C-alpha cells in the first residue's frame, strides 16, 4: 500500500558488501570505556 514511508530493504549480504567498500562522539565513547579501534 502506498504511503509516505516507502520500503527500503537491505539483505545481510548487501549490507556486508557495503561495509567492505569503505565527531565529538569519540569522547563519549571513550568516557563510557566503549571506544574501540
Amino acid at each position: 500500500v502506498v504511503s509516505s514511508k516507502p520500503v527500503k530493504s537491505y539483505t545481510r549480504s548487501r549490507l556486508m558488501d557495503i561495509r567492505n567498500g569503505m565527531i565529538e562522539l569519540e569522547g563519549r565513547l571513550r568516557r563510557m570505556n566503549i571506544w574501540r579501534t
Binding site: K5, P6, V7, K8, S9, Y10, T11, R12, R14, L15, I18, R19, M22, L25, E26, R28, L29, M32, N33, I34, W35, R36, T37
Partner: protein, 181 residues
C-alpha cells in the same frame, strides 16, 4: 565518500552501564543516532562487541523516539522474542547480535512497523538477545517476525525462541510465553 545508502528508519544506539540500579538512577545512555548504512558501520567499527563489554551491561538499538523501556508508549502493549544463549562462544555471540542489527536496519521483516528495537543482555553466565515488538495481540506480525528471526540466525531446537509480553515479564525470580519457536 559523499553518498550513503539511506535507511527506511532512523535508529538510536543505547548503552546500559548496569542492569540493577536504584529507582532514581538512570544507567541508560544514548550514544548516537544514524540514518545510513555507512553511518551504522562507522558506529559499529568503533564500539566494543558485546563479547567485550562489562558484565551487567546492555546494548540496545531502538527506532528514534522510542526508549529501551516497556513503559514507553511504543512498548507498553507489546512484547519480545527472547533468545537465551547458554555456553555460547564469543564470536557466535557477536555474530548473532550483529545479524540481529542487520535484520533491524535492513528491514528484514514484512511487519516492519511492528518492530520497536532489540536488546542484548550480557550477564557472562547466560546472555540474552531480544527483539521488541509493538503489539502482543498482533499474532500474524509476531509469528512472521519470529520465523524470520529463526531463519536469519539459523537456530535449531537447542536455542528456542520465546515470545513474552512485557506485562508478564514482571517476576523477581520463569515467565509465561505466548508463542514458542
Amino acid at each position: 565518500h559523499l553518498y550513503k545508502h539511506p535507511l527506511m528508519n532512523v535508529w538510536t544506539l543505547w548503552y546500559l552501564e548496569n542492569d540493577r540500579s536504584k529507582s532514581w538512577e538512570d544507567m541508560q545512555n544514548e550514544i548516537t543516532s544514524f540514518d545510513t548504512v555507512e553511518d551504522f558501520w562507522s558506529l559499529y567499527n568503533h564500539i566494543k562487541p558485546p563479547s567485550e563489554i562489562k558484565l551487567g551491561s546492555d546494548y540496545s538499538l531502538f527506532k528514534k523516539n522510542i526508549r529501551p523501556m516497556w513503559e514507553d508508549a511504543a512498548n507498553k502493549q507489546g512484547g519480545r522474542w527472547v533468545i537465551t544463549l547458554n555456553k555460547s562462544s564469543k564470536t557466535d555471540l557477536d555474530n548473532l547480535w550483529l545479524d540481529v542489527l542487520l535484520c533491524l536496519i535492513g528491514e528484514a521483516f514484512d511487519h516492519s512497523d511492528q518492530i520497536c528495537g532489540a536488546v542484548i543482555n550480557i550477564r557472562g553466565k547466560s546472555n540474552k538477545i531480544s527483539i521488541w515488538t509493538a503489539d502482543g495481540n498482533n499474532e500474524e506480525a509476531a509469528l512472521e517476525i519470529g520465523h524470520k528471526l529463526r531463519d536469519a540466525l539459523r537456530l535449531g531446537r537447542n536455542n528456542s525462541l520465546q515470545y513474552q509480553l512485557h506485562k508478564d515479564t514482571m517476576v523477581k525470580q520463569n515467565v509465561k510465553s505466548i508463542y514458542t519457536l
